């Protein structure tokens, strides 16, 4: 009987399922953390920390991830997770007199957090290579258009969209509308994109988003972070909620930007789990893989996306299902070691 | 030229331990400006923290089940959160927006307003009592049509001020069954004589959430989790917007224990209970002092003298509380009860500005 938004329509346990299988080591490849966990130095912290002393409070922080970007402190906003960015972003800018653009499929966070607000959601379906349709979404953008999102590499397909053609689509956008560039996997990108941290200061309308919650390994403790000119950083202060992060994630944060050996060898071996899955997309004419920049890879296989998952399930790989990511025939893996890619590579191929 | 922002966002706003000790000099300090339970945890909460390594992962069954039980409640009753302040986050979001407007006493907890702000909504601010007592009627008289969410802090914050169950029940009575009531029932498990059981409220008003928490009373300060009891409806609607982000393993694990430690509990509420009584011996010999009805783990006193000077000179001689000029109170300090010997050398140092 209560009086909720309208708007609001649109949007509508490891151990558990191990023991009702019978099966002894289940290996998750469903999110997007890294499989490999974190650097010796950051696993270090971590078992000499008890969550006995733990507490939400850092200089330290924004000084260590500033003095890494070659940035102003005053260019960087901290939340607890980029989730809650997201969530922020969409509170300060959008409403129902407001309309915003997206892809789809993309990170479903954006969809979500903007229909809550009561926004117009715009959405421009993907290239069928799977890359944002950049064109369509520079159409759709109105002067009552306040953000536009762009995932970087794409979740859930995992395309990249290299700089030179962000820097385009910047040049065009009008200068009132937000710009959210989405980073939350660039650190797997190969090779690696020029430093484009100071784009911000280029166009004082960008905010890039990233986390410690994917190469970092850190999805434990909650640390994303906004990069964004002065003006943007000082509105979003004004609007973020009584706590964020313990400051133990602050203390594990400050070591992970710190090894960069890690995410060296992390970045290399992912690339090699991409190389797995391509070699399997070759031999099988019938399989769609999309181009993949991140930790995942995305297959359609034609099946039915919960009886790919299921199968793959009960046999010891969890996955995450394409019927939820908006492709009823795929599901996305996370790439993992290479003796479970091969593991999931030979499953598949069983299907086919 | 800037950004689309909201208009609503014009009328917004805008750690201490070891920086302030230092930037002083002081061999020790003492918080008493948070509200958490100062006399810290159960021995078996902590046990298990201190049995338990940083290492932590994010995502409730057994805790639903434990808090479903220790109430007598459905599990499907129930709405976990990391914290209150996110649960309240939640419902302005849900039914907030530039044509609605909510109804709220003034002064009370600051996030009802931040986020109906935020929201867009219009804020009808109705001001306490003389006594410091919510003007439930004058907040009757304030519900509209565009009225969607009416919120009753009991024990109140800032001032500390309970209204008795009889009282609750009389205005829910009038309430439009349309309008949402929050009741905010954070100090709630301080409040003496204990109030009757009435979770099961929310059977018979189907327009009644009640929040509470673990971050005050069961000094949960590692975990953040709160929740929410409320009919089904309620819950299976608020279920659909909640983050995916919500709460530790452990900060679970954590809770389950707390809420079965009631020993500590009752412990807290007698210890607190005399930290209200030494205030009281306070004011009693003082008819300058201003003491509000306390019913909460902290006292607001009004010196008559500016808060942020209140403030410093408590700072200064070792103790931190929370300036009565950021909870609406100009004259204000809002201090902690803590440890019998800190609430006695805390009026003993207000004795001198006396």
Redesign the interface.
């Known amino acids: 009987?209560?009086?909720?938004?309208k708007s609001?329509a649109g949007?509508?346990?490891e151990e558990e399922v191990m023991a009702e299988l019978g099966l002894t080591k289940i290996t998750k490849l469903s999110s997007n953390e890294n499989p490999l966990g974190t650097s010796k130095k950051v696993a270090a912290?971590?078992?000499?920390?008890?969550?006995?002393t733990?507490?939400?409070?850092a200089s330290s922080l924004r000084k260590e991830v500033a003095d890494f970007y070659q940035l102003e402190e005053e260019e960087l906003i901290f939340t607890?997770?980029v989730?809650?960015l997201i969530?922020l972003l969409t509170?300060?800018?959008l409403?129902?007199?407001?309309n915003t653009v997206m892809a789809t499929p993309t990170f479903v966070?954006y969809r979500q957090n903007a229909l809550?607000?009561?926004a117009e959601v715009r959405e421009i379906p993907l290239l069928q290579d799977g890359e944002h349709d950049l064109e369509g979404m520079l159409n759709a953008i109105d002067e009552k258009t306040?953000i536009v999102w762009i995932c970087n590499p794409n979740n859930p397909t995992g395309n990249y969209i290299e700089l030179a053609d962000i820097q385009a689509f910047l040049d065009r956008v009008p200068?009132?509308?937000?710009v959210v560039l989405d980073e939350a996997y660039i650190e797997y990108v190969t090779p690696q994109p020029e430093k484009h941290e100071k784009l911000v200061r280029t166009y004082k309308?960008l905010i890039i988003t990233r986390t410690f919650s994917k190469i970092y390994g850190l999805?434990?403790?909650?640390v994303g972070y906004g990069i964004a000119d002065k003006?943007?950083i000082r509105?979003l202060?004004?609007?973020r909620?009584?706590?964020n992060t313990?400051s133990?994630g602050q203390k594990?944060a400050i070591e992970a930007i710190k090894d960069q050996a890690f995410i060296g060898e992390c970045r290399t071996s992912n690339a090699n789990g991409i190389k797995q899955y391509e070699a399997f997309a070759k031999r099988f004419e019938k399989v769609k893989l999309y181009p993949a920049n991140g930790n995942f890879v995305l297959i359609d296989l034609g099946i039915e996306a919960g009886t790919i998952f299921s199968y793959l399930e009960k046999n010891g790989y969890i996955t995450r299902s394409g019927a939820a990511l908006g492709f009823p025939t795929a599901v996305r893996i996370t790439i993992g070691k290479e003796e479970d890619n091969s593991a999931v590579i030979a499953l598949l191929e069983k299907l086919l």
């Open positions: 009987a209560m009086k909720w938004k609001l949007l509508s346990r912290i971590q078992a000499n920390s008890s969550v006995e733990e507490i939400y409070p607890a997770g989730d809650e969530e509170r300060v800018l409403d129902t007199t407001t966070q809550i607000e009561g306040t200068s009132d509308v937000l309308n999805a434990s403790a909650r003006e943007i509105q202060n004004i609007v909620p009584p706590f313990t133990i594990l």
